[PDB]
């Protein structure tokens, strides 16, 4: 639900409205005209009107473009701005004001040695009591910076009145005599050029316990990214983070119950930039080949995530996400301390079964080598499907409770083999090695809670169910002994076991009586009595014999095993 909602919005490239710096050989420039700088300052002044955050689509709480936010605190809804300083002027003689036009006898000159002017106090931007009610926020993308600037003779600027001019005049008034952005001294001079130099900025984010979804911004300029780093501090909520195609340093402080979800769609697909928007292409090959887990460091092909805090835990899972189509998505459940990950699928039974070859081909193209793939899904009507899929031989078991009836199917590739329309058993557990699957359960003989049989079986074909083992409790064992006693010499062969299974009505387990059970050459049956137990096993010729029996009275211990020829030793 988180990933599908995140993956829809066509997000802008960071710096689109504020302007991306273009690296002219020296000192990558930001703007090179008078009206361009006035427009940049208009964009800055928009933050007075909209506040520090703007609501896009009423869904994404996106910061003002190119604003230096250094800290966010969701616990008290307060932020801290960074520093945006600009070189101050000095000197100049004959200061005069005429129609808010500054006249001089000599133009002031720009000095890099005076402590520069900070802009943000001039703006009075709100930094407390913010409405952070949305779960979705795109992270800030601008580092702290000092703006060098240059003046040149620019005619025609006397009549320019936009909000950027008012912000510039405010900067002038707050620092009288230090900043003159346009002035007449025998000529009309104006701000001509802006060149920003960035400082390393660590954006500290303090989380709360509610659900939060973050989006990483796409910054195309290497300097800006390398001067940017994120540091989260969790507190025990559900947090998701959509990774960007261009890597940024991220550090996370783990608390006890953090559940973190890292969407990595932009890492596994060809990414293109069209009209300031991001377009995802085909799956890029081998994107996940470099998946590195260390107890404190998770590395994907170029994205590194460092973890801090409660790193010692070994009971905590972390999810990664990626979509293959509109319905079938692929998850990765990771345990850091165990360096473990096992793939999962989700979304459609019939679609997945029909296209299993293609899905497995894609998973191989991503470069993941885990042998078996779980399957978990919840549909719109809340019927839950779970199963195991073999990546090698495409044998897959799928279980789900339809209505009240448990349905259990086995597939070999893309065609059915078995379909139990009513599996009447409790404590069902399903295991698998590549080809051999095992279903263990407990069956109550004729709804009598006293007489239970623990069975372990294996599905072979449409009417073939191979029995691996049985365990009969006290009353079940007394019934077994009576059955031995009443058969007049047919107790040394497997067909005896088949007749017994027909006796207790084992076929009711599947609801239909056209089932052929296969008693293998290792079938072992354990019967418990009031004092001890006895285990019978089938030999190579398919004859049943006591393998091991033990029981103790108040003063005596009786044992028997096939090693000594079933001599009952009484001590």
Coordinates of C-alpha atoms in Angstrom, one line a residue:
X1 CA 0.0 0.0 0.0
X2 CA 2.9 2.3 0.7
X3 CA 4.9 1.5 -2.4
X4 CA 2.2 1.6 -5.0
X5 CA 1.1 5.0 -3.7
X6 CA 4.6 6.3 -3.7
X7 CA 5.4 5.1 -7.2
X8 CA 2.8 7.2 -9.0
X9 CA 3.9 10.8 -8.8
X10 CA 6.1 12.3 -11.5
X11 CA 8.4 14.3 -9.3
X12 CA 10.4 17.3 -10.5
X13 CA 14.2 17.3 -10.7
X14 CA 15.5 19.3 -7.7
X15 CA 16.5 22.8 -8.6
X16 CA 14.1 23.2 -11.6
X17 CA 12.4 26.3 -10.4
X18 CA 15.4 27.9 -8.6
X19 CA 17.7 27.1 -11.5
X20 CA 20.5 24.5 -11.7
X21 CA 24.0 25.9 -11.7
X22 CA 25.8 25.6 -15.0
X23 CA 29.5 25.0 -14.6
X24 CA 31.2 27.8 -16.6
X25 CA 34.9 26.9 -16.3
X26 CA 35.5 28.8 -13.0
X27 CA 33.0 29.1 -10.1
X28 CA 29.8 27.3 -11.4
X29 CA 27.4 30.1 -12.1
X30 CA 23.8 30.3 -10.9
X31 CA 22.4 33.3 -12.9
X32 CA 24.1 35.8 -15.2
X33 CA 21.6 38.6 -15.8
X34 CA 19.9 41.3 -13.7
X35 CA 16.4 39.9 -14.2
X36 CA 17.5 36.3 -13.6
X37 CA 18.8 37.3 -10.2
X38 CA 15.7 39.3 -9.5
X39 CA 13.7 36.1 -10.4
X40 CA 15.8 34.0 -8.1
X41 CA 15.1 36.4 -5.3
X42 CA 11.4 36.3 -6.1
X43 CA 11.5 32.5 -5.7
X44 CA 13.2 33.0 -2.4
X45 CA 10.6 35.5 -1.2
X46 CA 7.8 33.1 -2.0
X47 CA 8.6 31.4 1.3
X48 CA 7.2 34.3 3.2
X49 CA 3.8 33.8 1.5
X50 CA 3.6 30.0 1.5
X51 CA 5.7 29.3 4.6
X52 CA 8.6 26.8 4.7
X53 CA 6.6 24.0 3.1
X54 CA 4.1 23.8 0.2
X55 CA 1.4 21.2 -0.3
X56 CA 1.6 19.6 -3.8
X57 CA -1.4 17.6 -5.0
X58 CA -2.6 17.8 -1.4
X59 CA -0.5 14.7 -1.0
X60 CA 3.2 15.6 -0.9
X61 CA 4.5 18.2 1.6
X62 CA 7.4 19.5 -0.5
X63 CA 9.8 22.2 0.8
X64 CA 10.4 25.5 -1.1
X65 CA 12.9 24.8 -3.8
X66 CA 16.5 25.7 -2.8
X67 CA 15.9 26.6 0.8
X68 CA 18.5 25.6 3.4
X69 CA 16.7 23.7 6.0
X70 CA 19.1 22.0 8.4
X71 CA 16.9 20.3 11.0
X72 CA 13.3 19.0 11.3
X73 CA 11.7 17.9 14.6
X74 CA 8.4 16.0 14.2
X75 CA 8.0 15.8 18.0
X76 CA 7.5 19.5 18.4
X77 CA 6.9 20.6 14.8
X78 CA 9.9 22.9 14.6
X79 CA 12.7 23.4 12.1
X80 CA 16.0 25.2 11.9
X81 CA 17.2 27.0 8.8
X82 CA 20.7 27.0 7.5
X83 CA 22.9 30.0 6.6
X84 CA 22.6 31.8 3.3
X85 CA 25.0 34.7 3.4
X86 CA 25.9 37.2 0.6
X87 CA 29.0 39.4 0.2
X88 CA 28.6 42.9 1.7
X89 CA 29.6 46.1 0.1
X90 CA 31.6 48.9 1.8
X91 CA 32.8 52.4 1.0
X92 CA 31.0 54.9 -1.2
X93 CA 30.4 58.6 -0.6
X94 CA 27.5 61.0 -1.0
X95 CA 24.6 58.6 -0.1
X96 CA 21.3 60.0 -1.4
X97 CA 17.8 58.6 -1.8
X98 CA 15.6 59.8 -4.7
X99 CA 12.4 57.8 -5.6
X100 CA 13.9 54.9 -3.7
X101 CA 16.9 55.2 -6.1
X102 CA 20.2 55.3 -4.4
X103 CA 22.6 58.0 -5.7
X104 CA 26.3 58.1 -4.8
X105 CA 29.3 60.3 -5.4
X106 CA 31.3 57.1 -5.7
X107 CA 30.0 53.5 -6.1
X108 CA 30.6 51.3 -3.1
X109 CA 32.9 48.4 -3.7
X110 CA 32.5 44.7 -2.7
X111 CA 34.7 43.4 0.1
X112 CA 35.2 39.6 0.8
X113 CA 36.7 40.4 4.2
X114 CA 33.7 41.8 6.0
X115 CA 31.4 39.3 7.7
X116 CA 28.7 38.7 5.1
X117 CA 25.1 39.6 5.5
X118 CA 22.7 36.8 6.6
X119 CA 19.4 36.9 4.7
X120 CA 17.1 34.7 6.8
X121 CA 16.6 37.1 9.8
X122 CA 15.5 39.6 7.2
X123 CA 12.8 37.2 6.0
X124 CA 11.1 36.3 9.3
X125 CA 10.3 32.8 8.1
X126 CA 8.2 30.7 10.5
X127 CA 10.2 28.0 12.3
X128 CA 7.7 26.7 14.9
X129 CA 4.2 25.3 15.1
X130 CA 4.2 23.8 11.6
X131 CA 1.4 21.6 10.2
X132 CA 3.2 18.3 9.5
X133 CA 0.0 16.2 9.4
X134 CA 0.8 14.5 6.1
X135 CA 2.7 11.2 6.1
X136 CA 4.4 12.2 2.8
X137 CA 7.3 14.6 2.6
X138 CA 10.0 15.2 0.0
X139 CA 13.3 15.8 1.7
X140 CA 15.1 19.2 1.5
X141 CA 17.8 19.4 -1.2
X142 CA 19.8 22.7 -0.6
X143 CA 23.0 22.9 1.4
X144 CA 24.3 26.0 3.3
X145 CA 26.0 28.4 0.9
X146 CA 27.7 31.8 0.6
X147 CA 26.7 33.8 -2.5
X148 CA 29.4 35.8 -4.2
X149 CA 28.1 38.4 -6.6
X150 CA 29.1 41.0 -9.2
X151 CA 27.8 44.3 -10.3
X152 CA 27.8 45.8 -13.8
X153 CA 26.3 48.7 -15.7
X154 CA 22.8 47.6 -16.5
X155 CA 20.5 50.3 -18.0
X156 CA 16.7 50.2 -17.8
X157 CA 16.3 48.8 -14.3
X158 CA 14.8 51.8 -12.6
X159 CA 11.2 50.6 -13.1
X160 CA 11.6 47.0 -12.1
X161 CA 9.2 46.2 -9.3
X162 CA 8.7 42.6 -8.3
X163 CA 8.7 40.8 -4.9
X164 CA 12.4 40.0 -5.4
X165 CA 13.1 43.8 -5.5
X166 CA 11.2 44.2 -2.2
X167 CA 13.2 41.4 -0.5
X168 CA 16.4 43.0 -1.8
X169 CA 15.4 46.4 -0.4
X170 CA 14.7 44.7 2.9
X171 CA 18.2 43.2 2.9
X172 CA 19.4 46.8 2.3
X173 CA 17.4 48.4 5.1
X174 CA 18.2 45.7 7.7
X175 CA 22.0 46.4 7.1
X176 CA 22.2 50.1 6.2
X177 CA 25.2 51.1 4.2
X178 CA 26.4 47.5 3.5
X179 CA 24.3 46.3 0.5
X180 CA 23.2 48.4 -2.5
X181 CA 21.7 46.2 -5.2
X182 CA 21.0 48.9 -7.8
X183 CA 22.3 52.5 -7.7
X184 CA 23.0 55.5 -10.0
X185 CA 26.5 56.8 -9.9
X186 CA 27.0 58.5 -13.3
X187 CA 25.6 55.2 -14.6
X188 CA 22.9 52.6 -13.6
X189 CA 24.6 49.8 -11.8
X190 CA 22.8 46.6 -10.7
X191 CA 23.4 43.1 -9.4
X192 CA 24.7 41.3 -12.4
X193 CA 26.0 37.8 -11.3
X194 CA 25.4 35.3 -8.6
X195 CA 27.9 32.5 -7.8
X196 CA 27.1 30.2 -4.9
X197 CA 29.8 28.3 -2.9
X198 CA 28.3 25.5 -0.8
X199 CA 29.3 24.2 2.6
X200 CA 28.8 20.6 3.9
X201 CA 25.2 20.4 5.3
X202 CA 24.0 17.6 7.6
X203 CA 20.2 17.6 7.6
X204 CA 19.1 16.2 11.0
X205 CA 15.6 14.7 11.1
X206 CA 14.0 13.7 14.4
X207 CA 11.2 11.2 13.9
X208 CA 8.1 10.5 15.9
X209 CA 6.2 7.3 16.3
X210 CA 3.6 7.9 13.6
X211 CA 3.8 6.6 10.0
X212 CA 6.1 8.6 7.8
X213 CA 7.0 8.4 4.1
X214 CA 9.9 10.3 2.7
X215 CA 11.1 10.8 -0.9
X216 CA 14.8 11.4 -1.7
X217 CA 15.4 14.3 -4.0
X218 CA 17.2 13.9 -7.4
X219 CA 20.1 16.4 -7.5
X220 CA 22.0 16.4 -10.8
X221 CA 24.9 18.6 -9.7
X222 CA 27.7 16.5 -8.1
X223 CA 28.9 19.3 -5.8
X224 CA 25.4 19.8 -4.2
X225 CA 25.0 16.1 -3.6
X226 CA 28.5 15.7 -2.1
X227 CA 27.8 18.6 0.2
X228 CA 24.6 17.0 1.5
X229 CA 23.9 14.2 4.0
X230 CA 20.9 12.9 5.9
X231 CA 20.7 11.7 9.5
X232 CA 17.5 10.2 10.8
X233 CA 16.7 9.4 14.5
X234 CA 13.9 6.9 14.9
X235 CA 11.5 6.4 17.8
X236 CA 9.5 3.3 17.0
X237 CA 7.1 3.9 14.1
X238 CA 6.6 2.8 10.5
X239 CA 9.0 4.7 8.2
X240 CA 9.4 4.4 4.4
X241 CA 12.1 6.0 2.3
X242 CA 12.0 6.1 -1.6
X243 CA 15.6 6.0 -2.8
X244 CA 16.7 8.3 -5.6
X245 CA 18.6 7.5 -8.8
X246 CA 21.5 9.7 -7.7
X247 CA 23.1 8.5 -4.4
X248 CA 23.1 10.6 -1.2
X249 CA 24.7 9.7 2.1
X250 CA 22.1 8.5 4.6
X251 CA 22.6 7.6 8.3
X252 CA 19.8 6.1 10.5
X253 CA 19.7 5.8 14.3
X254 CA 17.8 2.6 15.0
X255 CA 15.4 2.5 18.0
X256 CA 13.9 -0.6 19.5
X257 CA 10.9 -1.1 17.3
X258 CA 11.7 0.7 14.0
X259 CA 10.1 -0.8 10.9
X260 CA 11.9 0.7 7.9
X261 CA 10.9 0.2 4.2
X262 CA 13.3 1.2 1.5
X263 CA 11.7 1.4 -2.0
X264 CA 14.5 0.8 -4.6
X265 CA 12.6 1.1 -7.9
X266 CA 14.8 3.9 -9.1
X267 CA 17.9 1.6 -8.6
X268 CA 16.9 -1.3 -10.8
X269 CA 15.5 0.5 -13.9
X270 CA 16.9 2.7 -16.6
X271 CA 16.3 6.3 -15.5
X272 CA 15.9 9.2 -18.0
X273 CA 15.2 12.9 -17.6
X274 CA 12.5 14.4 -19.7
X275 CA 11.2 17.9 -19.4
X276 CA 12.3 18.1 -15.7
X277 CA 10.5 14.9 -14.9
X278 CA 11.9 11.4 -14.2
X279 CA 11.0 8.5 -16.5
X280 CA 11.6 4.9 -15.5
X281 CA 12.6 2.4 -18.3
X282 CA 13.3 -1.3 -18.6
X283 CA 14.9 -3.3 -15.8
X284 CA 18.7 -2.7 -15.9
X285 CA 20.7 -5.9 -15.7
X286 CA 22.5 -7.1 -12.6
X287 CA 21.5 -4.0 -10.5
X288 CA 21.3 -6.1 -7.3
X289 CA 24.5 -8.2 -7.8
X290 CA 26.4 -6.0 -5.3
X291 CA 24.0 -6.4 -2.4
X292 CA 26.3 -6.1 0.7
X293 CA 25.1 -6.6 4.3
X294 CA 27.3 -5.8 7.3
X295 CA 25.9 -5.5 10.8
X296 CA 25.9 -1.7 10.5
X297 CA 26.2 -1.0 6.8
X298 CA 23.8 -1.9 4.0
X299 CA 25.2 -1.3 0.5
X300 CA 23.3 -1.4 -2.8
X301 CA 25.1 -0.9 -6.1
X302 CA 26.0 2.7 -5.4
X303 CA 23.8 3.6 -2.4
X304 CA 25.3 3.1 1.1
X305 CA 23.1 3.2 4.2
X306 CA 24.8 3.4 7.6
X307 CA 22.9 2.3 10.8
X308 CA 23.4 3.5 14.3
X309 CA 21.8 3.0 17.7
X310 CA 20.3 -0.4 18.6
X311 CA 22.5 -2.4 16.2
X312 CA 22.9 -5.4 18.6
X313 CA 19.3 -6.6 18.1
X314 CA 18.9 -9.9 16.2
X315 CA 15.1 -10.0 16.2
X316 CA 14.4 -7.1 13.8
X317 CA 13.6 -7.3 10.1
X318 CA 14.0 -4.6 7.4
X319 CA 12.1 -4.6 4.2
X320 CA 13.2 -3.7 0.7
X321 CA 10.6 -3.2 -2.1
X322 CA 10.5 -3.2 -5.9
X323 CA 7.8 -3.6 -8.5
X324 CA 7.9 -5.8 -11.5
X325 CA 4.4 -4.9 -13.0
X326 CA 1.1 -3.5 -11.9
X327 CA 0.1 -6.5 -9.8
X328 CA 3.2 -8.6 -8.9
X329 CA 5.7 -6.9 -6.6
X330 CA 9.0 -8.3 -5.1
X331 CA 10.0 -7.8 -1.5
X332 CA 13.3 -8.6 0.3
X333 CA 13.1 -9.3 4.0
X334 CA 16.5 -8.7 5.6
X335 CA 17.9 -9.5 9.1
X336 CA 21.1 -7.5 9.6
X337 CA 22.6 -9.4 12.5
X338 CA 22.2 -12.7 10.6
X339 CA 23.2 -11.2 7.3
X340 CA 20.1 -13.0 5.9
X341 CA 17.6 -12.2 3.2
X342 CA 14.8 -14.2 1.6
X343 CA 12.7 -13.1 -1.4
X344 CA 8.9 -12.8 -1.4
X345 CA 6.3 -12.3 -4.1
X346 CA 2.8 -10.9 -3.9
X347 CA -0.2 -10.1 -5.9
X348 CA -2.0 -12.7 -8.0
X349 CA -2.3 -16.5 -7.8
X350 CA -3.3 -17.3 -11.4
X351 CA -1.3 -14.5 -13.1
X352 CA 1.9 -15.6 -11.2
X353 CA 1.3 -19.3 -11.9
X354 CA 0.7 -18.6 -15.6
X355 CA 3.8 -16.4 -16.0
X356 CA 6.1 -18.1 -13.5
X357 CA 8.9 -18.6 -16.1
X358 CA 9.0 -14.9 -16.9
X359 CA 9.0 -13.8 -13.3
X360 CA 11.8 -16.2 -12.4
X361 CA 13.8 -15.0 -15.4
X362 CA 13.4 -11.4 -14.2
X363 CA 14.5 -12.3 -10.7
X364 CA 17.6 -14.0 -12.2
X365 CA 18.3 -10.9 -14.2
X366 CA 18.3 -8.9 -11.0
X367 CA 21.1 -11.2 -9.9
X368 CA 19.6 -12.8 -6.8
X369 CA 20.6 -16.4 -6.0
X370 CA 18.3 -17.6 -3.2
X371 CA 17.0 -21.1 -3.8
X372 CA 13.3 -20.9 -2.8
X373 CA 10.9 -18.0 -3.0
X374 CA 8.1 -17.5 -0.6
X375 CA 4.7 -16.2 -1.8
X376 CA 2.4 -14.1 0.3
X377 CA -0.7 -12.2 -0.8
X378 CA -3.9 -10.6 0.6
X379 CA -6.7 -10.0 -2.0
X380 CA -9.5 -7.4 -1.9
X381 CA -11.9 -9.9 -0.3
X382 CA -9.3 -10.7 2.4
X383 CA -8.6 -14.2 1.3
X384 CA -4.9 -14.8 2.1
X385 CA -2.7 -16.9 -0.1
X386 CA 0.6 -18.2 1.0
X387 CA 2.9 -20.7 -0.6
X388 CA 6.5 -21.8 -1.4
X389 CA 8.0 -21.7 -4.9
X390 CA 11.1 -23.6 -6.1
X391 CA 13.3 -21.4 -8.3
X392 CA 15.0 -24.4 -9.9
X393 CA 12.4 -27.1 -10.8
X394 CA 9.4 -24.7 -10.5
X395 CA 7.6 -27.1 -8.1
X396 CA 5.4 -24.9 -5.8
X397 CA 2.9 -25.5 -3.0
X398 CA 0.1 -23.0 -2.5
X399 CA -2.3 -23.0 0.4
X400 CA -5.2 -20.7 1.3
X401 CA -8.4 -20.9 3.3
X402 CA -11.3 -20.3 0.9
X403 CA -14.5 -19.8 2.9
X404 CA -13.9 -22.4 5.7
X405 CA -12.3 -25.0 3.5
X406 CA -8.5 -25.1 3.3
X407 CA -7.4 -25.6 -0.3
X408 CA -3.9 -26.9 -0.9
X409 CA -2.5 -27.1 -4.5
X410 CA 0.8 -28.4 -5.9
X411 CA 2.1 -27.1 -9.2
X412 CA 5.0 -28.3 -11.4
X413 CA 5.7 -25.3 -13.4
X414 CA 2.4 -24.0 -14.7
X415 CA 0.0 -27.0 -14.5
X416 CA -1.9 -28.5 -11.6
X417 CA -1.1 -31.8 -9.9
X418 CA -3.2 -32.0 -6.7
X419 CA -6.2 -30.1 -5.4
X420 CA -7.6 -30.9 -1.9
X421 CA -11.0 -29.2 -1.8
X422 CA -11.2 -29.7 2.0
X423 CA -8.1 -30.4 4.1
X424 CA -9.5 -31.2 7.5
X425 CA -6.4 -31.0 9.8
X426 CA -5.0 -28.8 12.6
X427 CA -1.5 -27.4 13.2
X428 CA -0.8 -27.7 9.5
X429 CA 2.8 -27.1 8.7
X430 CA 4.4 -27.2 5.2
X431 CA 8.1 -27.8 4.5
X432 CA 10.0 -28.3 1.3
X433 CA 13.4 -29.3 -0.1
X434 CA 13.7 -28.6 -3.9
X435 CA 11.7 -31.7 -5.0
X436 CA 10.4 -33.2 -1.8
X437 CA 7.5 -31.5 0.1
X438 CA 6.2 -32.4 3.5
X439 CA 2.8 -31.6 5.0
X440 CA 2.5 -32.3 8.7
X441 CA -0.8 -32.1 10.7
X442 CA -3.1 -33.5 13.3
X443 CA -6.3 -35.4 12.5
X444 CA -9.1 -36.1 14.9
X445 CA -10.5 -39.6 14.3
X446 CA -14.3 -39.0 13.8
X447 CA -14.3 -35.7 15.6
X448 CA -13.4 -37.4 18.9
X449 CA -10.9 -35.2 20.6
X450 CA -9.4 -38.1 22.5
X451 CA -8.3 -40.1 19.4
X452 CA -5.8 -38.1 17.4
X453 CA -3.3 -39.1 14.7
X454 CA -0.3 -36.9 13.9
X455 CA 0.4 -37.5 10.2
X456 CA 3.3 -36.5 8.0
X457 CA 2.5 -37.0 4.3
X458 CA 3.8 -35.9 0.9
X459 CA 1.7 -35.1 -2.2
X460 CA 2.8 -36.9 -5.4
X461 CA 0.0 -36.8 -8.0
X462 CA -3.8 -36.3 -8.5
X463 CA -4.8 -39.3 -6.4
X464 CA -1.4 -40.3 -4.9
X465 CA -0.5 -39.3 -1.4
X466 CA 2.7 -40.9 0.0
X467 CA 2.6 -41.3 3.8
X468 CA 6.0 -40.5 5.5
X469 CA 4.9 -41.1 9.1
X470 CA 2.3 -41.5 11.8
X471 CA 2.0 -40.9 15.5
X472 CA -0.8 -42.5 17.4
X473 CA -1.7 -41.4 20.9
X474 CA -3.0 -43.6 23.7
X475 CA -6.5 -44.4 22.5
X476 CA -5.3 -44.5 18.9
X477 CA -2.6 -47.0 19.9
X478 CA -5.1 -49.2 21.8
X479 CA -7.2 -49.3 18.6
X480 CA -4.1 -50.1 16.6
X481 CA -3.3 -53.0 18.9
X482 CA -6.9 -54.3 18.6
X483 CA -6.5 -54.2 14.8
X484 CA -3.3 -56.2 15.0
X485 CA -5.0 -58.7 17.3
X486 CA -8.0 -59.3 15.1
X487 CA -6.2 -59.8 11.8
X488 CA -5.3 -63.5 11.6
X489 CA -1.7 -63.4 10.4
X490 CA -1.6 -60.4 8.1
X491 CA 0.6 -58.1 10.2
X492 CA 4.0 -58.4 8.6
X493 CA 3.4 -56.4 5.5
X494 CA 2.6 -52.8 4.3
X495 CA -0.8 -53.8 2.9
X496 CA -1.6 -54.3 6.6
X497 CA -0.9 -50.6 7.1
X498 CA -3.1 -49.7 4.1
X499 CA -6.0 -51.7 5.5
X500 CA -5.5 -49.9 8.8
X501 CA -5.6 -46.5 7.2
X502 CA -8.8 -47.6 5.5
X503 CA -10.0 -48.7 9.0
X504 CA -9.8 -45.3 10.8
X505 CA -11.1 -43.4 7.8
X506 CA -7.9 -41.5 6.9
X507 CA -9.3 -40.6 3.5
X508 CA -11.8 -38.3 5.2
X509 CA -8.8 -36.0 5.6
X510 CA -9.2 -35.0 2.0
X511 CA -13.0 -35.3 1.9
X512 CA -12.9 -37.8 -1.0
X513 CA -12.4 -41.6 -0.9
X514 CA -10.6 -42.0 -4.3
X515 CA -7.2 -41.6 -2.7
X516 CA -4.3 -44.2 -3.1
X517 CA -1.8 -44.0 -0.3
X518 CA 1.8 -45.1 -1.0
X519 CA 3.5 -46.8 1.9
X520 CA 7.2 -46.2 1.2
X521 CA 10.2 -48.3 2.3
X522 CA 11.0 -45.9 5.3
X523 CA 7.4 -45.6 6.7
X524 CA 7.8 -45.3 10.5
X525 CA 4.9 -45.3 12.9
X526 CA 5.2 -44.3 16.6
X527 CA 2.6 -45.5 19.1
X528 CA 2.5 -44.2 22.6
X529 CA 1.1 -46.1 25.5
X530 CA 0.6 -45.1 29.1
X531 CA 4.1 -46.2 30.2
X532 CA 6.3 -45.6 27.2
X533 CA 6.4 -45.9 23.4
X534 CA 7.1 -48.2 20.5
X535 CA 8.3 -47.4 17.0
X536 CA 7.8 -49.7 14.0
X537 CA 9.6 -49.2 10.7
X538 CA 9.5 -50.7 7.2
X539 CA 12.4 -52.6 5.9
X540 CA 13.8 -53.0 2.4
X541 CA 11.4 -55.9 1.6
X542 CA 8.5 -53.8 3.0
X543 CA 8.0 -55.9 6.2
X544 CA 7.1 -54.1 9.4
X545 CA 9.1 -54.8 12.6
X546 CA 9.7 -53.2 15.9
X547 CA 12.5 -50.7 15.6
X548 CA 12.6 -49.5 19.2
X549 CA 10.3 -49.8 22.2
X550 CA 10.7 -48.6 25.8
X551 CA 8.5 -48.6 28.9
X552 CA 9.0 -48.4 32.6
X553 CA 6.9 -49.7 35.4
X554 CA 7.2 -48.7 39.1
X555 CA 10.2 -51.0 39.7
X556 CA 11.2 -52.4 36.2
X557 CA 12.5 -51.1 32.9
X558 CA 11.7 -52.9 29.7
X559 CA 13.5 -52.1 26.4
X560 CA 13.6 -53.7 23.0
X561 CA 15.4 -52.7 19.8
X562 CA 16.2 -54.3 16.4
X563 CA 19.9 -54.3 17.2
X564 CA 19.8 -57.3 19.4
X565 CA 17.1 -59.2 17.6
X566 CA 14.1 -57.7 19.5
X567 CA 15.1 -59.5 22.7
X568 CA 13.0 -57.8 25.4
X569 CA 15.5 -56.9 28.1
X570 CA 13.9 -56.5 31.6
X571 CA 16.0 -54.8 34.2

